[PDB]
Amino acid sequence: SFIRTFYGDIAPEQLGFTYSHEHIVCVPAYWQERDADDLLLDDKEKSQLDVQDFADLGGKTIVDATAVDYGRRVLDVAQISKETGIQIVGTAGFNKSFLWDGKIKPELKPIIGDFETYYEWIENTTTDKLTEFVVNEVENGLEGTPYKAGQVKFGTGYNMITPLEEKTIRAVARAHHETKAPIHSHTEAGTMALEQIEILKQENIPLEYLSIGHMDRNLDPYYHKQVAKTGAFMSFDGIAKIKYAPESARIAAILYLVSEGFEDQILVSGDTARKTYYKHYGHGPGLEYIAKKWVPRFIDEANEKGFDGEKLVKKFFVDNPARCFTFKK
């Protein structure tokens, strides 16, 4: 088996230290149209400086969760990978339905069809044709480029799975059946994981093939244990996001799952989606933050609370991503 990166399929042992959910260069139509400039990562050289910080700290791989509705700049990301040496796992599929109001860029029309918005495209395209689109991103390349995606994604809304969202879940599940690519989901504020899981079960998807994004947004031990029992990977990707929770709260939730025997299912990242989050755009914590500052604190705090901090860090950033992001064949 293998992990599919922009520059080739690699052995799991080659993945190394990994951030499991990030954004690098992207210009989401929905946000661009609303002049939300902070959500546009629109400078390749600035993004590259953060990725280089990661590389300098011993980082090896970034999973780039930018989906088709989030304004990919695949060629820029590929160039960054080439220049920094950081391996990139790209993402096929969809991010979240509120983005679908955004206009379809000219480059997508030859691939997707002559549709004004993502909503129009998704509403008027059969599930099977949506599956074809996702499969082609994994097998042929993203957005007319030769850089293939290494995971397939879908997303749901705040305490909602709409009919169209459900359609995309089924399209992505079926794309998994064809390609065997790992599956990632967006949960809005950490909601709807159990309902996502029910749809995937109807589609005959083994749940250990799924990583669920944004579990750190809903810090509920009972809910987390319900999700973990299915075998799904659980992504804590809001590290440093004090506006959502203090770091202690995220760390406590992680350690609860460890105490209940689920350490092998935990993934960690920063979901760095803003200029103000990048060191070299707006002087935020940057891609350096987790490796440089969070890791030593987690190790220390976990050790203080009786855990094996170093072993856990190795699992969260090395062993677990190597298990999660391998194709299922």
Q: Which is nearer to Zn ion, 67 or 253 (CB)?
A: 67
Helical axes 221-228 vs 247-259, angle rounded to 10°? 50
Q: Does 171 bind Zn ion (CB under 5 A)?
A: no
Q: Does 271 bind Zn ion (CB under 5 A)?
A: yes
Residue nearest to Zn ion (CB): 186
* 3-class DSSP state of 50: helix
**Distance of alpha carbon 119 from alpha carbon 74, whole angstroms:** 22
Return the range that interacts with Zn ion (CB under 5 A); candidates 76-84, 102-110, 186-194, 247-255.
186-194
Q: Does 188 bind Zn ion (CB under 5 A)?
A: no
Q: Does 250 bind Zn ion (CB under 5 A)?
A: no
Return the range that interacts with Zn ion (CB under 5 A); candidates 50-58, 65-73, 198-206, 252-260.
65-73
DSSP per residue, 147-214: --EEEEEEE-BTTB--HHHHHHHHHHHHHHHHH---EEEE-GGG--HHHHHHHHHHTT--GGGEEETT
Q: Does 153 bind Zn ion (CB under 5 A)?
A: no
Return the range that interacts with Zn ion (CB under 5 A); candidates 74-82, 131-139, 222-230, 267-275.
267-275
Q: What number of chain residues touch Zn ion (CB under 5 A)?
A: 4
* Options 186, 217, 275, 280; binder of Zn ion; rule CB under 5 A: 186
Q: Which is nearer to Zn ion, 176 or 186 (CB)?
A: 186
DSSP per residue, 215-278: GGGS--HHHHHHHHTTT-EEEE--TT-TTT--HHHHHHHHHHHHHTT-GGGEEE-----SGGGS
Which residues lie near Zn ion (CB under 5 A)?
65, 186, 213, 271
